[PDB]
């Protein structure tokens, strides 16, 4: 009855004047990279040693 497309779209973080939305991992980019590259460095320091 509504005479419209039977789809409902909701954004997570809206993009200004844009139908689709921007997710969470867009701002979280390179933070995971740095944190992983430091944790891997710490694990490298511990494991590549002589205990």
């Amino acid at each position: 009855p509504d005479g419209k497309l039977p789809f409902v779209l909701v954004p997570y973080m809206p993009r200004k004047r844009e139908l689709y939305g921007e997710a969470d991992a867009e701002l979280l980019g390179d933070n995971q990279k740095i944190l992983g590259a430091t944790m891997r460095g710490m694990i490298d320091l511990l494991g590549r040693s002589a205990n």
């Binding site: 390179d30 990279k33 740095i34 992983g36 590259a37 891997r40």
Partner: protein, 234 residues
């Protein structure tokens, strides 16, 4: 790029000036001590070409099936094949630049496909061990292969011809003379000559230290840190 004839003259005026075999014109060396001096220049260049990386050369080594140990001698080359001591030739050299048996240390070997193979890696299939400095032990001679072996090199042996040209940096000629003087003056076993040999030998280190304290022999190395991007680290 001086000549051995010129090296004889320059040696006769600076280092071997009080030597007996200096001819009456003072600008040459008599024909009885020339084997001695030539045997000192050859050792002199070998030492200088050992400390500094002065001559980096690569000679490709084709794979022959059934052979894993690949000595990098001149008897196995193509232009200098010696059928009496080599079953088949597997090194590759052009007539203008034949193999001169001048390998001091092997540094980095690539393949016919472009894959770098590690050296002396116990846990590393695709690794070419060297059981002795002038050899090579490839454990899998695959079909259609070859090995561009980048190695430290010494000056080609000076046979004695006075027209053979010497590859030494101009700044290091004051150290070759101070090593010929050391070798010559130390064999006379006289107190006066021995004390001069020490001075000439110590000056060899002093000049070989000033050459490395000013990067005149290309010893300092800088490379792009390609490891950074591979380990992650966005």
């Amino acid at each position: 790029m001086r000549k051995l004839s010129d090296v004889y003259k320059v040696l006769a005026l600076t280092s071997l000036k009080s030597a007996g075999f200096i001819t009456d014109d003072k600008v040459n060396i008599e024909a009885w001590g020339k084997p001695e001096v030539l045997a000192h220049i050859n050792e002199g260049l070998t030492r200088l070409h050992s400390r500094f990386v002065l001559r980096t050369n690569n000679c490709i080594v084709e794979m022959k099936e059934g052979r894993t140990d690949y000595p990098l001698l001149a008897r196995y080359s193509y232009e200098r094949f010696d059928p009496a001591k080599a079953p088949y030739p597997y090194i590759m050299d052009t007539p203008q630049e034949p193999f001169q048996e001048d390998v001091i240390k092997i540094l980095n070997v690539y393949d016919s496909k472009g894959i770098r193979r590690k050296l002396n890696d116990d846990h590393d299939k695709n690794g070419l061990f060297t059981p002795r400095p002038d050899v090579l032990q490839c454990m899998w001679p695959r079909h259609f292969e070859a090995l561009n072996v980048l190695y430290q090199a010494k000056h080609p042996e000076l046979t004695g011809d006075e027209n053979q040209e010497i590859d030494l940096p101009e700044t290091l000629y004051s150290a070759l003379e101070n090593w010929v003087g050391y070798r010559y003056h130390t064999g006379l076993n006289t107190e006066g000559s021995t004390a001069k040999a020490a001075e000439y030998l110590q000056l060899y280190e002093s000049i070989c230290g000033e050459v490395v304290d000013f990067d005149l022999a290309n010893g300092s190395m800088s490379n792009t840190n390609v490891l950074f991007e591979k380990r992650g680290w966005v």
